[PDB]
Design a protein around this ligand. Structure first.
Ligand SMILES: Nc1ncnc2c1ncn2[C@@H]1O[C@H](CSCC[C@H](N)C(=O)O)[C@@H](O)[C@H]1O
Ligand SMILES: [Zn+2]
Lengths: 107, 179, 94, 80, 352, 97
């Protein structure tokens, strides 16, 4: 009957928890979704999103810009080793390639 | 044994770094990317790419510990950005103390000190047969002294450049006068 | 008069304004980040479901999510993400 | 232990190449093949031990090897 | 600095190490091996000091004394002997009833030790002779009772086999405080081991259902006899469900460390706030046996099949000790230095 | 006193090994290799026999496929003998590196 503090800031997170638990119920992944598994999963998604947005915003400052256009995401994914090993077969729209001229072509 | 009051007991050196050993496009800094993107990764490379050991030319030289490819940055030469008449007072002061001049200038209005404050980039000798050079960039106006390369350089070679007194380089077409 | 659509615009917006206090984000990058979040969620939930079906169980606990993350992510990124999740569960516990 | 990466002998790579259809072999293929085989066995055995320690046992059954090969993309028929 | 982070070597010299404990000062570490060998190292220069091959039997418990001289033995023939760091000779010898688990000296007198069997009440003896004082416990049903002194030496906290705590006096057995904890829903479970801090009166409760509770040594005295206190901080784990083996404290009551019993792990909480802050690891398939915290520097010693690993902060070398006038900068530091351009007090040199 | 012109014994070895089906690696060194590189991920494991058989089958099939694609590359390069840069080119085109 009192105030209800949410499950998004009871653990100190940002991604929602009730929406993740609804998407694990409405999907038939299994029968009985456990206690804190959506909290664990929302923390993992937070960490990956923060990891990619750091490099995105850094490259966006270094190209003398203020907004972000997907060329920066293309650079931030394809520069690092680990994200390039994860996102193998993905074509980002409006992406572009990395500069790579071979050794024997240029004089 | 307790009969030698022998000389060579003076050093005149604040740098007693010299020890017994004296061992002599996958990345970002060799890309065609814009300059501050390479300028970030500059410091993550330069802290462990090279080394400083004893050289036959003049004391301590710069033998790198990584196979540097041609065209990329190596290290920054930074320190106290002094302004142009404190140079002469420090010339008189280090003439009074007996330590040589370590002063590269960004432009002909402001010079950069290295003796009082700096990094490990001081151990670059002058030679008339270099394999590096220098370009000044614009990291948001705060310009820098960063050293590129010229050719493919392997592990165990001294890095030099032209500073523009007989030199100890022994070049094929040496000038032998550093003015 | 429109039907509501699920999204992730506000949450990406919040994490961006935590980690970079000035830089804004356009429309297309928001759509890309939306698709990326949905993609990683699909992979992790599917692998956890196949595990819990293998071991003769009926319950997706946190332990299966841990084993799915360890199987899927490469090395050092997994070693960070497991500790981030365990810190979150411990703060939620008491 | 140190050996048994060299215990894979050297008519054996020759016999595998002459099952594959190879005529004349140079003298570097031996160490190159040892390196490639070691990399692949690492990337199978790691997922095998992961499934084992998740299942809470202390042996490595055949089904775990089949599951690791199935997730890599190289299905094996004949042991399930 | 703070809590350790990196691996930093080992001492894999002595075969089959089993247990370990420190002194007050943090420079003495004896190890009761698998055959009676008692080995001390150095810590500053890290050399093996003294092997004491006392028994033909293995050792299960040890303790240091307040003067930094005396030890105590616990073999598989119940032999309790007084030792010395100068000589290393046997003094006392007699046989208990067969189980002996852990001993503990009195803090402010090296006369008395508190000895605990398995299926009996804990017994306090002296070191002058074989005098023993019978300690009464409330249940006296299973007689699986643990007991320990507090920090300063005021009382003796005991723990039964059923989940009730008695607070007795060291000589007259003054039952002055007691409490029962609401263990979950139905079953109240036993206590493994209770250990005590060095700054203040904080301590921990280590049950048999894998939950650590934090209490103080003043709130229970305020609640008196048969009171109901609350845990100052609850510590538990949910993911791997984490059985425990060994518990101890940090340097000056700052943090709490607790080694595990399954995954060869070390966890570091905070007594102040109350959250886990670092997970350690090591060899994946070993078996953790004994964990000791270092009292004046962040060092943790962990025995897992002979190997003693010392997590010791991974110090980083630099300049400015060679030439203390040159400051190794990071980026461009421009400035001007000078705005203005150019007694017989007898201090003891033998102040020991 | 007779010796063949070199190549004929190679050709009949190719036909004789592509005829039959067997196992081409001795099982004791392969078993010790599997235990050796499984030691570093968890101490004191205990293998069954059929798991060792399955690993041997998978490794042998992978090596044979790699050698066929390498020989295609080398015949494209107007040569005969396999060089290791052909192996590196095949592994880089396929996407494994
Ligand atoms: N070719 C040369 N031979 C000897 N000294 C040189 C030289 N060219 C320049 N110099 C002087 O030598 C200095 C190089 S510093 C020499 C390395 C370092 N000081 C050491 O411990 O050995 C410069 O300040 C310059 O004034
Ligand atoms: Zn010269």
């Amino acid at each position: 009957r009192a105030k209800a503090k949410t499950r998004s800031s009871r653990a100190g997170l940002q991604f929602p928890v009730g929406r993740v638990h609804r998407l694990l119920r409405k999907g038939n992944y299994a029968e009985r979704v456990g206690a804190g598994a959506p909290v664990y999963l929302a923390a993992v998604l937070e960490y990956l999103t923060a990891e990619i947005l750091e490099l995105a915003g850094n490259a966006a400052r270094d190209n003398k810009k203020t907004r972000i256009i997907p060329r920066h995401l293309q650079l931030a994914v394809r520069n690092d080793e680990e994200l390039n090993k994860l996102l193998g077969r993905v074509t980002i729209a409006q992406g572009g390639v990395l500069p790579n001229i071979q050794s024997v072509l240029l004089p | 044994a307790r009969a030698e009051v022998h000389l060579r007991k003076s050093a005149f050196d604040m740098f007693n770094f010299l020890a017994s050993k004296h061992r002599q496009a996958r990345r970002a800094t060799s890309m065609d990317l814009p300059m501050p993107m390479r300028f970030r990764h500059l410091k993550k490379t330069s802290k462990e790419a090279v080394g400083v050991y004893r050289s036959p030319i003049h004391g301590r030289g710069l033998f790198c510990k990584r196979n540097i490819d041609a065209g990329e940055m190596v290290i920054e030469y930074a320190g106290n950005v002094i302004r142009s008449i404190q140079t002469d007072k420090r010339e008189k002061y280090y003439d009074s103390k007996g330590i040589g001049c370590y002063m590269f200038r960004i432009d002909d209005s402001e010079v950069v000190d290295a003796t009082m404050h700096g990094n490990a980039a001081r151990f670059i000798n002058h030679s008339c047969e270099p394999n590096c050079y220098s370009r000044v960039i614009n990291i948001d106006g705060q310009k820098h002294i960063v050293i590129f390369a010229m050719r493919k350089i392997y592990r165990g070679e001294e890095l030099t450049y032209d500073y523009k007194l007989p030199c100890n380089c022994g070049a094929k077409k040496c000038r032998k006068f550093l003015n | 008069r429109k039907t509501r659509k699920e999204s992730y615009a506000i949450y990406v917006y919040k994490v961006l304004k935590q980690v970079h206090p000035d830089t804004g984000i356009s429309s297309k990058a928001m759509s890309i980040m939306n698709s990326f979040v949905n993609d990683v969620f699909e992979r992790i939930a599917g692998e956890a479901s196949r595990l819990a079906h293998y071991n003769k169980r009926s319950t997706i606990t946190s332990r299966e999510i841990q084993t799915a993350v360890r199987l899927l992510l490469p090395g050092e990124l997994a070693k960070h993400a497991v500790s981030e999740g365990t810190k979150a569960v411990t703060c939620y516990t008491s | 232990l140190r050996d048994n990466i060299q215990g894979i002998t050297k008519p054996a790579i020759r016999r595998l190449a002459r099952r594959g259809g190879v005529k004349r072999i140079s003298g570097l293929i031996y160490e190159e093949t040892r390196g490639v085989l070691k990399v692949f066995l690492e990337n199978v055995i790691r997922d095998a031990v992961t499934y084992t320690e998740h299942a809470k046992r202390k042996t490595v059954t055949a089904m775990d090897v089949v599951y690791a090969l199935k997730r890599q993309g190289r299905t094996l028929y004949g042991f399930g | 600095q703070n809590y350790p982070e990196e691996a930093d070597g080992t001492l894999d010299c002595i075969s089959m190490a089993l247990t370990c404990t420190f002194n007050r000062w943090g420079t003495l570490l004896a190890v009761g091996c698998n055959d009676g060998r008692i080995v001390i190292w150095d810590f500053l220069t890290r050399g093996i000091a003294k092997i004491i091959s006392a028994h033909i039997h293995p050792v299960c418990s040890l303790c240091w004394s307040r003067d930094g001289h005396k030890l105590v033995s616990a073999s598989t023939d119940n032999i309790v002997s007084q030792w010395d760091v100068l000589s290393g000779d046997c003094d006392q010898r007699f046989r208990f009833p067969s189980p002996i688990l852990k001993v503990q000296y009195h803090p402010r007198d090296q006369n008395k030790v508190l000895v605990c069997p398995m299926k009996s009440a804990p017994v306090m003896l002296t070191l002058s002779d074989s005098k023993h004082v019978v300690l009464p416990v409330d249940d006296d049903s299973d007689l699986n009772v643990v007991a320990s002194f507090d920090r300063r030496g005021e009382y003796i906290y005991t723990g039964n086999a059923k989940g009730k705590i008695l607070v007795l006096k060291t000589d007259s057995q003054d039952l002055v405080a007691s409490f029962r904890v609401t263990t979950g829903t139905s079953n109240t479970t036993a206590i493994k081991s209770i250990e005590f801090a060095r700054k203040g009166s904080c301590f921990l409760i280590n049950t048999a259902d894998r939950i650590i509770r934090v209490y103080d040594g003043r709130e229970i005295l305020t609640c008196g006899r048969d009171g109901e206190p609350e845990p100052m901080q609850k510590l538990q784990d949910l993911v791997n469900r984490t059985p425990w083996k060994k518990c101890c404290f940090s340097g000056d009551g700052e943090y709490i460390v607790a080694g595990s019993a399954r995954q060869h792990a070390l966890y570091i909480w905070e007594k102040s706030i109350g959250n886990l802050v670092k997970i350690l690891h090591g060899t994946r398939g070993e078996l953790l046996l004994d964990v000791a915290w270092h009292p004046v520097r962040p060092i943790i010693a962990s025995i897992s099949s002979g190997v003693v690993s010392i997590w010791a902060q991974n110090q980083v070398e630099n300049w400015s000790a060679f030439a203390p006038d040159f400051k190794e900068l990071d980026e461009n530091v421009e400035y001007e230095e000078r705005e203005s351009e150019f007694e017989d007090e007898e201090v003891d040199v033998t102040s020991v | 006193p007779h010796r063949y012109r070199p190549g004929t014994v190679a050709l009949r070895e190719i036909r004789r090994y592509q005829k039959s089906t067997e196992l081409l690696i001795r099982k004791l060194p392969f078993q010790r290799l599997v235990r050796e590189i499984a030691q570093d991920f968890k101490t004191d494991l205990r293998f069954q026999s059929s798991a060792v058989m399955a690993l041997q089958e998978a490794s042998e099939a992978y090596l044979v496929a790699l050698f066929e694609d390498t020989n295609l590359c080398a015949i494209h390069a107007k040569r005969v003998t396999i060089m290791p840069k052909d192996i590196q080119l095949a592994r880089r085109i396929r996407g494994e590196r």
